[PDB]
């Protein structure tokens, strides 16, 4: 009946002014937009249908047309920025926010979904959804004693939409909206559904991707322990956002970094730094770099947890981008560590893999590695062991490469190269 209609037929029905004919045509439109085979979004837009669908959202008397119009508008808003803009320009936002109060749960959910697509377009639409007052009605739908009594699909859609209201920078969401949402997010981060957890962690990852003040809002709510627990999960869709959030947090102050350490995070990194997913290894090594950039007592906790051999490991063999983060982690460690800590690092075998990476075709990593050699030499100078280190570097193929680098395009390279040679070789 409502399968495989032309746009011309949908228009004729929608312009009928028979509410039932309009309902059938709206359903036909929804079925068009629901096909995965290149749905005719732009034809629907050009036919002038969006305003019609929008006004159908307000027909309380006819709940099916409300739902069918909601779903159609959801799928248009799922497209390009320009397609999302057509929906917004049609007045959909306040109309979807009204539908959040629908007594029919399927209609409520569809409105949640639509607003999620709208907010997910970018900061401007996110903030427009917020200005139209979406947050209160959204949070009201989660105001139950136990999240478990709500339908699974519904809770997941709400969580996802909330995560899109936390998403995007330039600018980041309004501080007062973030404060309003955070308590609910903390509750969702303790729910037992893998998908609710993943999206909750993504939200937290977004909120922590900013200056120390943004991080502090999150860290102050006491979520770091739960993030660390989630970091230990089996499901990669949970670990990925949890790790991103933990990594963001350690870009903050040393006191913010300490919360992560105090919550037990470092005990998961043996797995993370050997994880079979490239991205987890990269992001875990990146996280380590910002912990090695901390205080000496923090560096010492890295040492105590047994993670220096893991850094040696990643430096020795990983995707290049991971090895680059490992180089940073080492340079940070050597920059901030005590003499004893730098000695330990050399005893764990850092010299050969550092030297192997000077063959890299990446000017940045060379500068990072050269910095690290310098800092290590500085620690040797304080021990009168510049000779032993010189020999080690010579014996694993290092001197050759540092020499060659005295004749390198980049200035810092050739400079730091010649300084090392002349002082130590």
């Amino acid at each position: 009946g409502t399968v495989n209609w032309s746009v011309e037929d949908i228009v004729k029905g929608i312009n009928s002014n028979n509410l039932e004919s309009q309902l059938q045509a709206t359903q036909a439109a929804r079925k068009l937009l629901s096909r995965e085979k290149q749905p005719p979004i732009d034809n629907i837009i050009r036919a002038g249908l969006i305003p019609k669908f929008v006004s159908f959202l307000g027909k309380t008397d006819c709940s099916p047309i409300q739902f069918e119009s909601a779903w159609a508008l959801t799928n248009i808003a799922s497209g390009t920025s320009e397609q999302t803009k057509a929906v917004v320009d049609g007045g959909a936002i306040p109309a979807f926010i009204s539908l959040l109060a629908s007594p029919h749960a399927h209609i409520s959910e569809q409105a949640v979904w639509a607003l999620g697509n709208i907010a997910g377009d970018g900061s401007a639409f996110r903030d427009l959804v917020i200005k139209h007052g979406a947050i209160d009605p959204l949070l009201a739908l989660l105001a139950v004693p136990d999240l478990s009594t709500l339908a699974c699909g519904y809770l997941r859609n709400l969580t996802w939409t909330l995560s899109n209201l936390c998403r995007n920078k330039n600018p980041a969401p309004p501080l007062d909206a973030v404060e309003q949402i955070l308590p609910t997010l903390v509750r969702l981060l303790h729910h037992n559904d893998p998908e609710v957890l993943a999206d909750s962690c993504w939200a937290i990852s977004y909120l922590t991707d900013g200056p120390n003040e943004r991080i502090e809002m999150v860290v102050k709510k006491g979520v770091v322990p739960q993030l660390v627990k989630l970091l230990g999960a089996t499901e990669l869709p949970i670990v990925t956002p949890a790790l991103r959030a933990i990594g963001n947090i350690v870009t903050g102050t040393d006191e913010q970094t300490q919360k992560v350490i105090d919550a037990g995070a470092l005990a998961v990194f043996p797995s993370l730094l050997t994880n079979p997913k490239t991205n987890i290894q990269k992001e875990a090594t990146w996280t380590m770099s910002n912990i090695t950039a901390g205080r000496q007592d923090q560096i010492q906790q890295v040492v105590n947890h047994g993670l220096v051999p893991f850094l040696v490991g990643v430096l020795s063999k990983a995707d290049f981008k991971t090895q680059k983060e490992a180089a940073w982690a080492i340079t940070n460690y050597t920059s901030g560590g005590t003499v004893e800590q730098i000695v330990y690092l050399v005893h764990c075998g850092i010299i050969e893999p550092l030297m192997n990476l000077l063959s890299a075709k990446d000017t940045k990593i060379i500068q990072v590695i050269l910095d690290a050699i310098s800092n290590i030499f500085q620690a040797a100078e304080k021990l009168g062991e510049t000779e032993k280190l010189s020999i080690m570097i010579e014996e694993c193929g290092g001197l050759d490469k540092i020499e060659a680098l005295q004749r390198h395009e980049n200035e810092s390279v050739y400079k730091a190269s010649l300084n090392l040679i002349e002082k130590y070789f």
Binding site: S34, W71, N75, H106, N117, D121, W160
Partner: peptide, 9 residues
């Protein structure tokens, strides 16, 4: 992702 189509129900 950022946006998601509803495909059936």
């Amino acid at each position: 992702p950022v946006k998601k189509e509803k495909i059936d129900e």
